[PDB]
Design a binder for this molecule. Structure first.
Ligand code: 5BY
Ligand code: 5BY
Ligand code: CL
Ligand code: CL
Ligand code: MG
Lengths: 117, 196, 243, 241, 204, 250, 244, 226, 231
């Protein structure tokens, strides 16, 4: 077939570009940052009325000072959240402090390109 | 054990006794402690017989493989292979080895490798438990560029005294002569060397 | 067909097309040469000045292995560096075990086997470089040239890259006109000339000359770069011959 | 059609990669020959130095595997040297483990088994070489054993390898039909080399100078290659009768 | 501390005319404390009998191990294992644990179903085979058993006579050992019938 | 590097065929004819020594191989594949049996081990099947004399008599007419030579035919005396002369 | 690299089927028919050897019926070599269970273990599945006499009467017609042979083309006996039932 | 244990006693200490009994496979090398002290091997607890150019010296002769100088002497039909 | 075409297409400029934003007190390579108490990128780097390409429209090399150089990113109102 980590002639990774198409099919999530706080909101999008909507968990706590909203193949997010929570708590253990939001985000993004064969 | 290697004008001569002991019992009275690792590179073995045999067997294998690829190895190269084994496995080995060989370019060379795994290039070398009794004699009587007959007498007299005083040394005196002419084996029996 | 899509696949000819495609990368590269002299070897290479912004004498191409071997190559520069890194590991382990510095024929096979190994599997790509290398050992001077296939031979003179045919012709003249041999200082002068003559194949951009040498008399059997007055002397000799 | 790229069976029960490795064997365009004397085994091979820039002393397809065993290769030099290095390692290991020099036929079998593995395992390609091993074995006497990319091997009275092997083979066949013996009835190896060169000249129909040939000789307890001057002396003796 | 004398026990085997006998005591203890008086040490895999003395956990473990191996042997070979072959299997299995051995003293007894020849054998804890013609002994009272067997035994005894000889050898040896006794069992084995007798002995 | 072929190269096709096994059997069909016949007091296995060149010494190439003192083997198909199988077969006879039970394995169980090795080459990653069919003749105390065929798939069947390779279809028909349950070993050797002559084109003599038997114990071939229970190998390879003697009474 | 030559044995089709499993089942449909019939007092296992020869040594031959332990046996349909790999694994599993719990392994537990091994080859590893279907005939003290079948997919089911291999559609119809719950072993023996006799591709059903076995409590008092029928015994039961 | 090896004109002979001990107790009175590595290569073993047997079987197995691979008769130096490398690897923990001898295409050979991996060459050798008693005899009576008959006598005399004078040695004398161009003859119980005298009394008991509690038939047969 | 499926495959003309496609990713990236004198070395980078609400992607990374780089292409690949440099700079300090030479830093990057171009399974790096530094032999500027090729230069530029800045530096070569002991004038020349690669957009306060290292100047990055001076 073809490599999973293959570059296209335009200089983009095929698999990364295809995963972005899957995210476009996902339910909407919106975030707004202010000086008084940051707001996160999501569309639940239940597939049927018999589905108990409160079980749809698309907004998630990472730590007391960090939250997270998701969109796309939401099953894939569970291991990312687990890593984020571990990273946040681990840093508190090592340094007796809250972890910077940027540093937490960077830790999550390090997982992204760890794919291959 | 009484072993020695002596360089001279035409090359180098190795010498050794023939006694192997298990405490005070002589397990072998006709042992051959002069062993061949290459055509004109031989060694004298002292210490554990098992360890020194295993080492010499490996070295012979390395130099056989060296020769197949890069041609005849130097005596220094042979000493380095011995060293690498004795040094890296110093905790588990008890081996005191003297390496001696003949090149046409470098002529006769002698390297001694004691317990630690250090290497020492010398004009002549002595080793083994019986060597202690002849440090004085060998230092006083050694000369550089001796003749073959002079060198044989020097080794014969030296090992004779080492055998006389050391209980772990005895039997026959074996010698191996390494020159451009070839490889000559010599042997000297008690009745000959005791009366010296 | 499809035999050329994968490395280590024999075609119906009995050929490995992937190795033959690696040769095309070598032929695309700059010219590099080697000259065996009386008591040593001389290496020279063409460095294309792509821009004025390149710092002169800084982007060094010729590489030393151990202290007595020089290596130069044409083709994919990174592939050559990878090969030299291995050569340095091979030379280090040889000296570690056997004490003496690695002989040149011994060193030649170490590279040869390694390059040849990269033609045995489809999981690896062949080397995109032809490497000219050599030096002085106990048995004297040796010059070698190693191809992507792993093939190598000893040489009196060697040349590879885009200007290899021009160079080869010049080397052949030296072999005929000097059966008794060529001196080390002569070989440096001739090396400069041959690179300048071979530059006609890369005549669009101007270039920078780089020479090195190992000689028993001139460098005590150690690899050194030709610098300063001796380099300028060779450039002047080269410039005089083209005019 | 990926059954032609890796070593798996085609519908005809064939291994195309093995067959193509046989074709790589003749890429060098060199012919070799091996014969047995009373006390010796001689192997000769064509030497071709096309480039004037080459150092002719380094151009060789004959290898000294051990003190007793020699090997001539028909095929590209990279694969040739690969096989040579391995055979040298195997011969040395054998001596260390089992306490005696590896016989010629046993080494041939070992290398043949290695070649067989490449015909069965997909990730390893066959080597495009035919290996001819020669020695004077201490049990079997003068010995010639030849290995190919298929993993096949067999002993020989005499043998030939290369583009024009068939012409050489028939020439040798016809000689042994006359003499009705399995070897060259000759005391000295010098005359056995002269026989080998003479019958190659007759078979190929070409004359040879000292630099056109390469000769290897196996005697009891050593194998050695002849220099250009040793071959010249051999060519002079042939011309004088 | 000494593994071979924590639990205690003995086994003895003898040959007779077209028959073999194997016997063991029934004691299992924790040093001075007697725990069980029903701990049999003789097992059988088809027509091959195995007695094991020593550390009781290893006795149990080895029985389960040889049951395992003989059941597979039978499935593949389509026949029951013979004493000569089983003897080699025990030696193999024990020597594979050369530097971490089972602390046991096995004894094999049986009759070859094809030749009809009586067969006994003994082992040390690491595999060494003792293939005796007369008798084999094992356990904490092996010295006692050697003395009894070497004096009482005579060749070519009939099954009913052999029973008396082996029973007296065991009983009198066990009574001179603090860690053996508490009951005894004797197997009398013929080519196609096997009788098992529990002996009445002193319970101290 | 690394062997990155961890996947099967033999797979089921839509029709349910395992292609590589079928193709391996085709390679066996092209191979030289070999046969086996079982008698009351022995077994015989035979094949043609198809010499690749008259300069080649065909004695050095052994198509009939001893696996144990009482078990022999012959093949049809790819010779190199056969050679490595014999090496593995001899070794597995020791490692998986003799070193455990102190005796050589019975014919059927050694065959089972060989079959296992050939099955694994049919399913394991990055390998092709063995391109050979084996005929394994042998004797053991409890099963007596026996003859087995082993195919590239790993399947094995016991035979009274059979043939494999080039002219197997004709040879099996010839054996059906001649075989009975009262054959002595000499009668089986005679029938083997008759059957093998049909598939051979050129020279037919002791030097071009390879033939071995599993018969009586050979104390003369044991190499030592002093142990009554050791009576010698039942496997014996017939000499060139011994074959020619029986070709006169043919 | 190597990806080029990978068949990808463990993938779904667009329809949600496992290619290799489906093709393995196609292979098995050409194998000799094997039948299992469960009765109140025992179980019968019958199976047809594939186009044999007169020169095949039958009395020492075994291609269909195998013994897993004293209580459990299997009938094979497919590649014999593949089956023997699994059979030896099953024999070991039974002995492991016996060593651990000191009790004979329950039939279902053994079946599930083998079926799980087959499943693994369809989900991971990139290897081809085993081209084998089993009929398990066994007894234990929980469920008594039991018949199971497993196929390359690793799926297994329990049966009163079942066939695998060739002509199962025709065979299953005939069994469904004449089978009754209060049936006995002697009657089940007759049913098994009559079904093979009608579904066979051969001209006539003879002793040399059959393997036969029974698992009976017809053993002296409360215990179970496995009987692998000999050639002469198969010949006699063929005359008794009136087929030859 | 007393084991010896003696070279002679056209071959080599080895011999051994037949006692096995467990401290001061005799475990086996007729132990077999002469092991066959290959048809014409036999070794005698002293030390740990299971070790000498196992190490001999292993090397003998690998020698057989080697002989089949090379299509050659095995050599003594091959067995010697494989043994010493194995024993050296286990740093003496495998307590096998061997005397290896045999004939092969090279000639007749005699070697000794110690548990730590050291080998020795000789015309006459002895190992074990009775090696000093045996070597005393060998040093007194050995000569160059011995005949087969003289060598067997010397070897068995050396073992007897151990049997009588060493408490670790006893019972019978085993011999193996390996002559060039001949089959090796293994002479089990070549000498039997320690037969037990007749006992003064018979200790056969009256039937019914032993007290029994229970009886029962043991089922050794398989599960039955019907 | 048929020879661009993976990095292990040469084309019939001896080209490695996967490496060339990785080189293409750099051309899509935002422009960045590098230049040096004898005393100082300067990096100037045009940062790119996603939209008006988004931040401007950082282009410059610090590797040590005396070394750092600017990136163009896949930012995560620059993080992997800069992390490797940080470790190598750090290994040199801890083991040898030695600041890593800029030339040797380039050799290490070359060899790391190369392994990804000759092996199956992996992929080439999709980023180009401009490394500046001041070591024992003065100021240095390097250009890294993911093919493995590393080049020491007086000045250069990589990314989209980088040819304009590269020409300007080629004219100004004789002027800016002489700017010794004057950091502000060297930055001015760098800001004027990167301006030749601009179209439509101009240099704003949160758009521009500058870094400098020199004789008595640790590697420091300037962003925000710190670069308003140079606009
Ligand atoms: C090259 C050697 C011949 C030079 C001389 N070395 C020796 O003789 C040594 C001295 C020695 C050194 C290290 C440890 C111990 C003893 N001896 C042996 O190694 C010989 C031992 C054989 C042996 C004895 N045993 C136990 C037998 O039970 C009684 N197992 N193997 B020389 O004296 O230095
Ligand atoms: C080849 C042998 C037959 C030659 C003669 N050797 C022996 O008989 C030895 C003498 C011996 C050696 C080593 C330790 C003990 C006793 N006998 C056994 O090997 C029988 C030992 C049984 C035993 C061993 N152990 C402790 C386990 O650790 C090992 N407990 N019971 B010969 O007398 O030297
Ligand atoms: Cl020694
Ligand atoms: Cl092999
Ligand atoms: Mg009490």
């Amino acid at each position: 077939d073809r490599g999973v980590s293959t570059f296209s002639p335009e200089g983009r990774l095929f698999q990364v570009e295809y995963s972005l198409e899957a995210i476009k099919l996902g339910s909407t999530a919106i975030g707004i940052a202010t000086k008084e706080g940051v707001v996160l909101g999501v569309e639940k999008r239940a597939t049927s009325p018999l589905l108990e909507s409160d079980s749809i968990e698309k907004i998630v706590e990472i730590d007391r000072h960090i939250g997270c909203a998701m969109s796309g193949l939401t099953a894939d997010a569970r291991s990312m959240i687990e890593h984020a929570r571990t990273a946040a708590v681990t840093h508190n253990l090592y340094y007796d402090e809250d972890i910077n939001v940027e540093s937490l985000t960077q830790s999550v993004c390090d997982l992204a390109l760890r794919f291959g064969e | 054990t009484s072993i020695m290697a002596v360089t001279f004008k035409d090359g180098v001569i190795l010498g050794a006794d023939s006694r192997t002991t298990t405490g005070a019992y002589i397990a072998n009275r006709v042992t051959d402690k002069l062993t061949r690792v290459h055509d004109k590179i031989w060694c004298c073995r002292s210490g554990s017989a098992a360890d020194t045999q295993a080492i010499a067997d490996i070295v012979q294998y390395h130099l056989e493989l060296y020769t197949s690829q890069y041609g005849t190895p130097s005596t220094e190269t042979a000493a380095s292979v011995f060293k690498e084994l004795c040094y890296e496995n110093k905790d588990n080995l008890t081996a005191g080895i003297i390496v001696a060989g003949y090149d046409d370019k470098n002529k006769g060379e002698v390297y001694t490798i004691p317990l630690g795994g250090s290497v020492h290039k010398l004009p002549y070398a002595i080793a083994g438990s019986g060597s202690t009794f002849i440090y004085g004699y060998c230092d006083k009587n050694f000369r550089e560029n001796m003749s073959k007959e002079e060198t044989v007498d020097f080794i014969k007299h030296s090992l004779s005294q080492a055998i006389k005083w050391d209980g772990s040394s005895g039997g026959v005196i074996r010698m191996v002569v390494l020159t451009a002419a070839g490889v000559e084996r010599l042997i000297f029996y008690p009745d000959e060397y005791e009366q010296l | 067909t499809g035999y050329d899509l994968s490395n280590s696949v024999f075609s119906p000819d009995g050929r490995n097309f992937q190795v033959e495609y690696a040769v095309k990368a070598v032929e695309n590269g700059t010219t590099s040469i080697g000259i065996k002299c009386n008591d040593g070897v001389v290496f020279a290479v063409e460095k294309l000045i792509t821009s004025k912004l390149l710092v002169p004498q800084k982007n060094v191409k010729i590489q030393v292995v151990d202290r007595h071997i020089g290596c130069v190559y044409s083709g994919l520069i990174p592939d050559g560096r990878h090969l030299v890194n291995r050569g340095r590991e091979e030379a280090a382990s040889f000296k570690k075990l056997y004490k003496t510095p690695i002989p040149i024929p011994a060193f030649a096979d170490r590279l040869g086997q390694y390059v040849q190994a990269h033609t045995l599997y489809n999981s690896v790509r062949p080397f995109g470089v032809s490497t000219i290398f050599g030096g002085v050992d106990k048995n004297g001077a040796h010059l070698y040239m190693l191809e992507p296939s792993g093939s190598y031979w000893g040489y009196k003179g060697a040349a590879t890259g885009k200007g290899r045919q021009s160079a080869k012709a010049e080397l052949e003249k030296l072999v005929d006109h000097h059966p008794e041999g060529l001196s080390a200082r002569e070989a440096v002068k001739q090396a400069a000339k041959i690179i300048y003559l071979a530059h006609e194949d890369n005549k669009e951009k101007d270039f920078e000359l780089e020479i090195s040498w190992c000689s028993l008399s001139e460098t005590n059997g150690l690899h050194k770069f030709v610098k300063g007055d001796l380099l300028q002397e060779a450039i002047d000799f080269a410039q005089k011959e083209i005019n | 059609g990926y059954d032609r790229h890796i070593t798996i069976f085609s519908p005809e029960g064939r291994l195309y990669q093995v067959e193509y490795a046989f074709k790589a064997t003749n890429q060098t365009n060199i012919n070799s020959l091996a014969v047995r004397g009373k006390d010796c085994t001689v192997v000769i091979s064509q030497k071709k130095v096309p480039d004037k820039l080459l150092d002719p002393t380094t151009v060789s397809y004959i290898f000294c595997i051990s003190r007793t065993i020699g090997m001539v290769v028909n095929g590209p030099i990279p694969d040739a040297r690969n096989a040579a290095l391995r055979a040298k390692a195997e011969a040395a290991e054998f001596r260390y483990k089992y306490g005696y020099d590896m016989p010629c036929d046993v080494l041939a079998k070992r290398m043949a088994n290695l070649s067989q593995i490449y015909t069965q395992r997909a990730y390893m390609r066959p080597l495009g070489v035919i290996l001819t091993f020669v020695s004077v074995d201490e049990e079997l006497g003068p010995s010639i054993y030849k290995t190919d990319p298929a993993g096949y091997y067999v002993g020989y009275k005499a043998t030939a390898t290369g583009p024009k092997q068939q012409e050489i083979t028939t020439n040798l066949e016809n000689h042994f039909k006359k003499s009705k013996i399995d070897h060259i009835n000759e005391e000295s190896w010098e005359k056995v080399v002269e026989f080998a060169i003479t019958h190659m000249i007759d078979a190929l129909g070409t004359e040879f100078s000292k630099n056109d040939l390469e000769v290897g000789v196996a005697t009891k307890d050593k194998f050695f290659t002849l220099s250009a001057e040793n071959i010249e002396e051999r060519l002079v003796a042939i011309a004088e009768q | 501390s000494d593994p071979s004398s924590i639990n205690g026990g003995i086994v003895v085997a003898m040959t007779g005319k077209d028959c073999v006998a194997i016997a063991c005591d029934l004691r299992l203890g924790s040093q001075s404390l007697g725990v069980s008086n029903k701990f049999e040490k003789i097992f059988h895999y088809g027509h091959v009998f195995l007695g094991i003395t020593g550390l009781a956990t290893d006795v149990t473990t080895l029985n389960e191990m040889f049951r395992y191996k003989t059941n597979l042997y039978k499935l593949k070979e389509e026949r029951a294992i013979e004493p000569e072959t089983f003897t080699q299997l025990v030696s193999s299995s024990l020597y594979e644990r050369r530097f971490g051995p089972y602390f046991v003293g096995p004894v094999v007894a049986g009759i070859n179903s094809k030749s009809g020849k009586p067969f006994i054998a003994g082992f040390d804890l690491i595999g060494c085979i003792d293939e005796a013609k007369d008798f084999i002994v094992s356990g904490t009272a092996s010295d006692q058993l050697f003395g009894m067997c070497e004096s009482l035994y005579e060749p070519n005894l009939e099954p009913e006579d052999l029973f008396e000889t082996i029973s007296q050898a065991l009983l009198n040896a066990a009574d001179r050992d603090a860690l053996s006794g508490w009951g005894a069992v004797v197997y009398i084995i013929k080519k196609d019938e096997v009788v098992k007798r529990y002996l009445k002995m002193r319970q101290d | 590097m690394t062997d990155r072929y961890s996947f099967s190269l033999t797979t089921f096709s839509p029709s349910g065929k395992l292609g590589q096994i079928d193709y391996a059997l085709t390679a066996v069909k092209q191979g030289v004819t070999s046969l086996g016949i079982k008698a009351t007091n022995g077994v015989v296995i035979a094949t043609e020594k198809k010499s690749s060149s008259p300069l080649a010494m065909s004695e050095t190439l052994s198509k009939v191989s001893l696996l144990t003192p009482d078990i022999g083997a012959v093949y049809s198909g790819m010779g190199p594949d056969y050679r490595v199988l014999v090496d593995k077969s001899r070794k597995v006879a020791h490692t998986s049996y003799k070193r455990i039970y102190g005796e050589y394995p019975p014919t059927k169980l050694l065959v089972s081990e060989v079959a296992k090795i050939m099955q694994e080459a049919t399913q394991s990653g990055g390998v092709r099947p063995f391109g050979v069919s084996l005929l394994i003749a042998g004797h053991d105390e409890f099963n007596g004399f026996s003859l087995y065929q082993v195919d590239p798939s790993g399947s094995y069947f016991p035979w009274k008599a059979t043939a494999i390779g080039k002219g197997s279809v004709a040879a099996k028909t010839f054996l059906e007419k001649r075989w009975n349950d009262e054959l002595e070993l000499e009668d089986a050797i005679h029938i083997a030579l008759l059957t093998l002559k049909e598939s051979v084109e050129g020279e037919f003599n002791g030097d071009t035919i390879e033939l071995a038997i599993i018969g009586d114990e050979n104390p003369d071939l044991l190499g030592y005396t002093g142990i009554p229970t050791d009576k010698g190998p039942r496997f014996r390879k017939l000499t060139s002369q011994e074959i020619n003697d029986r070709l006169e009474a043919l | 690299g190597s990806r080029r030559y990978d068949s990808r044995t463990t993938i779904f089709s667009p329809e949600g089927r496992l290619y290799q499993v489906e093709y393995a089942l196609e292979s098995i449909s050409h194998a000799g028919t094997a039948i299992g019939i469960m009765a109140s007092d025992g179980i019968v296992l019958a199976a047809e050897r594939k186009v044999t020869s007169t020169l095949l040594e039958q009395d020492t031959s075994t291609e269909k019926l195998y013994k897993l332990n004293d209580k459990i046996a299997v009938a094979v349909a497919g590649l014999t070599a593949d089956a023997e790999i699994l059979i030896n694994t099953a024999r070991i599993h039974a002995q492991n269970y016996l060593k651990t719990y000191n009790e004979d392994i329950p039939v279902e537990i053994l079946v599930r273990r083998l079926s799980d091994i087959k499943q693994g080859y369809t989900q991971h590893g990139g290897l081809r599945p085993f081209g084998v279907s089993f009929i398990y005939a066994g007894y234990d003290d929980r469920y008594g006499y039991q018949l199971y079948t497993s196929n390359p997919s690793g799926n297994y089911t329990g049966w009163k009467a079942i066939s695998v291999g060739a002509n199962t559609s025709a065979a299953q119809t005939l069994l469904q017609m004449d089978y009754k719950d209060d049936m006995k072993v002697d009657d089940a023996i007759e049913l098994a042979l009559k079904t093979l006799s009608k579904t066979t591709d051969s001209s006539a059903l003879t002793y040399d083309r059959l393997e036969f076995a029974t698992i009976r409590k017809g053993a002296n008092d409360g215990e179970v006996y496995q009987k692998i029928f000999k050639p002469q015994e198969i010949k006699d039961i063929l005359v008794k039932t009136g087929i030859t | 244990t007393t084991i010896v090896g003696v070279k002679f004109n056209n071959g080599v002979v080895i011999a051994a006693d037949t006692r096995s001990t467990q401290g001061p107790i005799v475990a086996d009175k007729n132990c077999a200490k002469l092991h066959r590595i290959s048809p014409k290569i036999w070794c005698a073993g002293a030390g740990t009994a299971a070790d000498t047997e196992a190490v001999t079987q292993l090397i003998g197995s690998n020698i057989e496979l080697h002989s089949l691979y090379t299509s050659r008769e095995p050599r003594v130096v091959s067995a010697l090398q494989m043994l010493k490398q194995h024993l050296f690897k286990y740093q003496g923990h495998i307590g096998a002290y061997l005397i290896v001898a045999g004939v092969d295409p090279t000639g007749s050979h005699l070697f000794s091997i110690h548990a730590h991996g050291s080998t020795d060459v000789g015309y006459y050798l002895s190992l074990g607890s009775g090696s000093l008693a045996a070597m005393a005899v060998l040093e007194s009576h050995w000569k160059q150019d011995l005949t087969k008959e003289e060598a067997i006598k010397l070897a068995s005399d050396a073992i007897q010296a151990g049997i009588w004078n060493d408490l670790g040695s006893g019972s019978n004398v085993d011999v193996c002769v390996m002559e060039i161009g001949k089959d090796a003859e293994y002479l089990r119980n070549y000498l039997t100088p320690n037969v037990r005298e007749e006992k003064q009394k018979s200790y056969k008991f009256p039937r019914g002497t032993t007290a029994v509690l229970k009886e029962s038939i043991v089922n050794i047969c398989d599960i039955q039909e019907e | 075409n048929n020879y661009d499926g993976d990095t292990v495959t040469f084309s019939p003309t001896g080209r490695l297409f996967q490496v060339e496609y990785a080189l293409e990713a750099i051309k899509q990236g935002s422009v960045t400029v590098g230049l040096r004198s004898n005393t100082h070395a300067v990096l100037v980078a045009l940062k790119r934003n996603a939209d008006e609400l988004s931040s401007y992607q950082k282009k410059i990374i610090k590797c040590d007190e005396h070394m750092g780089l600017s990136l163009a292409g896949l930012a995560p690949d620059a993080r992997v390579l800069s992390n490797y440099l940080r470790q190598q700079c750090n290994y040199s300090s801890l083991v040898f108490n030695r600041k890593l030479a800029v030339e040797r830093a380039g050799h290490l990057l070359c060899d790391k990128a190369q392994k990804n171009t000759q092996s199956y399974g992996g992929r080439p790096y999709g980023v180009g780097l401009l490394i500046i530094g001041y070591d024992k032999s003065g100021a240095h500027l390097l250009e890294f390409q993911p093919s493995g090729n590393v080049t020491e230069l007086y000045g250069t530029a990589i990314g989209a429209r980088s040819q304009g800045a590269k020409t300007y530096l080629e004219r100004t070569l004789d002027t800016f090399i002489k700017i010794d002991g004057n950091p502000d004038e060297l930055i001015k020349a760098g800001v004027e150089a990167i301006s030749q690669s601009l179209r439509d957009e101009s240099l704003t306060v949160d758009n521009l990113s500058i870094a400098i290292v020199g004789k008595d100047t640790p590697f420091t990055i300037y962003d925000g109102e710190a670069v308003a001076k140079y606009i």
